[PDB]
Amino acid sequence: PRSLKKGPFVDEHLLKKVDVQNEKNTKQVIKTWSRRSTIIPDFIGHTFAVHDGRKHVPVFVTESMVGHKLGEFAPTRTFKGHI
Amino acid sequence: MKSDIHPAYEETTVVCGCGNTFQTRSTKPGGRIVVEVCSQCHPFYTGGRVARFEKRY
Amino acid sequence: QPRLKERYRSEIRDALRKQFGYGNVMQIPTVTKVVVNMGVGEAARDAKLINGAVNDLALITGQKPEVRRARKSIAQFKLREGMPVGVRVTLRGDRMWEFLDRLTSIALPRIRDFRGLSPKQFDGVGNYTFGLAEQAVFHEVDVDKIDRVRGMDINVVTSAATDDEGRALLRALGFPFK
Amino acid sequence: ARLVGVDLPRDKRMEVALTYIFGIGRTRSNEILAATGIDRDLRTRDLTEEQLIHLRDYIEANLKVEGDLRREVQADIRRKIEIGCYQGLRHRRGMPVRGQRTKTNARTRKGPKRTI
RNA sequence: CUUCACACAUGCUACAAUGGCCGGUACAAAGGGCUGCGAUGCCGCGAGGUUAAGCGAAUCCUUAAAAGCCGGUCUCAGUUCGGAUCGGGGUCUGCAACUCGACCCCGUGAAGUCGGAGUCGCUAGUAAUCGCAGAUCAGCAACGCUGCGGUGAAUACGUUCC
Numbered sequence: 284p285r286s287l288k289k290g291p292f293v294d295e296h297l298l299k300k301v302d303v304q305n306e307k308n309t310k311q312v313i314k315t316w317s318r319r320s321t322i323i324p325d326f327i328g329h330t331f332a333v334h335d336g337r338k339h340v341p342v343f344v345t346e347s348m349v350g351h352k353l354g355e356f357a358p359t360r361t362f363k364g365h366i
Numbered sequence: 367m368k369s370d371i372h373p374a375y376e377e378t379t380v381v382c383g384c385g386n387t388f389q390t391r392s393t394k395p396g397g398r399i400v401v402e403v404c405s406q407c408h409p410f411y412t413g414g415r416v417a418r419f420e421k422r423y
Numbered sequence: 424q425p426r427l428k429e430r431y432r433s434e435i436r437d438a439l440r441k442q443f444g445y446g447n448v449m450q451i452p453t454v455t456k457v458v459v460n461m462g463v464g465e466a467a468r469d470a471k472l473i474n475g476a477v478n479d480l481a482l483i484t485g486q487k488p489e490v491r492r493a494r495k496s497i498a499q500f501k502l503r504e505g506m507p508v509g510v511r512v513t514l515r516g517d518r519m520w521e522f523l524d525r526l527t528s529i530a531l532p533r534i535r536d537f538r539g540l541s542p543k544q545f546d547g548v549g550n551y552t553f554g555l556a557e558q559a560v561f562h563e564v565d566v567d568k569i570d571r572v573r574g575m576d577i578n579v580v581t582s583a584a585t586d587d588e589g590r591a592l593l594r595a596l597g598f599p600f601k
Numbered sequence: 602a603r604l605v606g607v608d609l610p611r612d613k614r615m616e617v618a619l620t621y622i623f624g625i626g627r628t629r630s631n632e633i634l635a636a637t638g639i640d641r642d643l644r645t646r647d648l649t650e651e652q653l654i655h656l657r658d659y660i661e662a663n664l665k666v667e668g669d670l671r672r673e674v675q676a677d678i679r680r681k682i683e684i685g686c687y688q689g690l691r692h693r694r695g696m697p698v699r700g701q702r703t704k705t706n707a708r709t710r711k712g713p714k715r716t717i
Numbered sequence: 718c719u720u721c722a723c724a725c726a727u728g729c730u731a732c733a734a735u736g737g738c739c740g741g742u743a744c745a746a747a748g749g750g751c752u753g754c755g756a757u758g759c760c761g762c763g764a765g766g767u768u769a770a771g772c773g774a775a776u777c778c779u780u781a782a783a784a785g786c787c788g789g790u791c792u793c794a795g796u797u798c799g800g801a802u803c804g805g806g807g808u809c810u811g812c813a814a815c816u817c818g819a820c821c822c823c824g825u826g827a828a829g830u831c832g833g834a835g836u837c838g839c840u841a842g843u844a845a846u847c848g849c850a851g852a853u854c855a856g857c858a859a860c861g862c863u864g865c866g867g868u869g870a871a872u873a874c875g876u877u878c879c
């Protein structure tokens with residue numbers, strides 16, 4: 284949680300969903316609402332259906348988005364332009 | 367045309383702070399050109415995000 | 424006797440026969456001429472290339488350059504025919520070898536943030552052209568007696584047949600390539 | 602007096618003359634001149650070439666200056682754009698990235714008034 | 718609820734030399750404190766971490782006031798003015814700081830050189846300028862709001878006109 288003394292922050296209900304798939308090596312999608320969770324290097328290759336407010340958006344953790352929050356890839360607002 | 371229209375051009379000693387010295391023919395007045403860097407002491411002449419998270423924890 | 428020339432016939436003249444298997448020593452490539460020009464296109468306006476391009480290429484190279492006039496009028500460039508737009512010097516013999524040695528030793532590393540020259544700038548025969556971007560590459564001009572800054576592009580015309588044959592020559596003289 | 606290819610402004614005190622290097626401000630300028638022993642109340646026209654060697658090599662061993670700082674800065678902005686993060690989309694549009702108010706301000710990231 | 722081709726409104730910080738920065742040193746008032754105030758010591762460039770004294774307080778902590786004064790330097794420059802924006806590294810609060818928190822360090826160094834038509838406040842401890850405190854509150858977008866003291870002017874013929 285944002286300070287190095289207390290580690291990074293991942294939700295515990297999200298850590299259990301990949302540890303049942305890291306044990307048997309499958310890549311099923313994880314429907315989730317946890318935008319506040321940090322991406323850690325055990326999410327590499329996993330895909331995630333991440334809630335933005337109205338639907339779930341797929342995000343593929345590659346290698347370089349591994350210091351970011353998971354909500355940063357499902358944009359909440361919408362703006363195409365005024366004209 | 368190869369007479370007193372061209373600039374003066376005589377022997378000129380070049381030294382570097384590295385310790386290089388050689389002798390050419392140039393237009394510097396006095397022949398005492400001094401460089402800070404040359405062909406002997408310059409670089410190029412002799413030369414992940416996952417690890418960022420690992421370094422924090 | 425310029426020292427880049429005696430270094431040329433000592434080992435460069437003999438190392439090229441073992442890389443490229445020439446039958447006769449009249450086939451070994453050699454740089455024939457080095458041509459430097461400014462190309463002052465901002466002299467159609469205000470007509471001041473006198474102190475600008477002429478008086479510094481005399482100090483860089485050692486002899487007074489030729490002024491090149493425009494051959495056809497282009498309206499968009501505000502260019503009229505017969506108007507001075509280019510300043511060029513051509514270097515042969517000892518002043519050529521004393522330019523190439525002085526260029527690669529103390530001048531070509533003075534380029535700001537220099538990481539080498541491209542080895543793909545050969546035209547197809549083995550003639551190399553690269554462009555400088557400032558006059559302060561050379562110590563022989565000073566920053567305080569000049570007008571506005573301007574660059575120059577430098578041809579190195581060799582006796583080479585092809586590109587990698589001309590690339591192996593200039594590598595052996597001391598051009599730094601990346 | 603070229604230091605790292607930077608052309609220091611002549612007749613200027615040495616505490617400020619190092620700050621004209623891209624990558625050195627006033628805190629680094631105090632600790633270039635503290636490790637090399639060159640005093641701060643010194644003009645740059647009275648500089649010694651033997652002194653200029655002392656701080657033209659302290660900098661590559663420790664610091665990050667022109668070119669390879671400027672390319673590391675523009676490869677961090679580049680990194681955010683292809684990963685598709687929030688700040689990368691926000692870098693692509695010229696809108697401000699650090700959670701700024703965009704209703705009445707952000708005339709720095711945007712230009713002057715378009716005035717529709 | 719924080720969106721952003723734009724438009725208005727109230728403020729803040731500026732455009733510097735009656736100033737900036739560095740060193741030294743002086744003088745307040747009114748308030749807050751038990752899910753607290755944290756002296757002292759110690760570690761850190763710093764925000765802070767840690768240890769723990771004293772105190773439901775005219776007792777202890779908050780608490781070093783800042784302008785001011787004296788010395789040094791910059792020398793009129795888009796700069797040692799300005800501090801937006803952006804890159805990197807952090808601390809703390811909180812289950813949680815991506816959307817969307819504040820603060821600290823290093824780097825970056827935008828517009829701006831006193832503002833068109835217009836328009837506002839103020840008659841004395843006032844205006845102008847300088848800090849400090851409180852409420853709400855885990856933290857805070859506090860430059861707001863309600864207060865508190867510091868230094869401290871210039872003018873008013875006059876009633877024709879608005």
Ligand SMILES: [Mg+2]
Nearest residue numbers: 702704718719
């Ligand atoms: Mg609202």
Ligand SMILES: [Mg+2]
Nearest residue numbers: 737797798799
């Ligand atoms: Mg300042």
Ligand SMILES: [Mg+2]
Nearest residue numbers: 739740741742
């Ligand atoms: Mg002071």
Ligand SMILES: [Mg+2]
Nearest residue numbers: 759760761762
């Ligand atoms: Mg300490």
Ligand SMILES: [Mg+2]
Nearest residue numbers: 786787788789
């Ligand atoms: Mg003073």
Ligand SMILES: [Mg+2]
Nearest residue numbers: 795828829830
């Ligand atoms: Mg301007």
Ligand SMILES: [Mg+2]
Nearest residue numbers: 733793794830
């Ligand atoms: Mg001014």
Ligand SMILES: [Mg+2]
Nearest residue numbers: 853854856857
């Ligand atoms: Mg509060």
Ligand SMILES: [Zn+2]
Nearest residue numbers: 382384404407
């Ligand atoms: Zn050298």
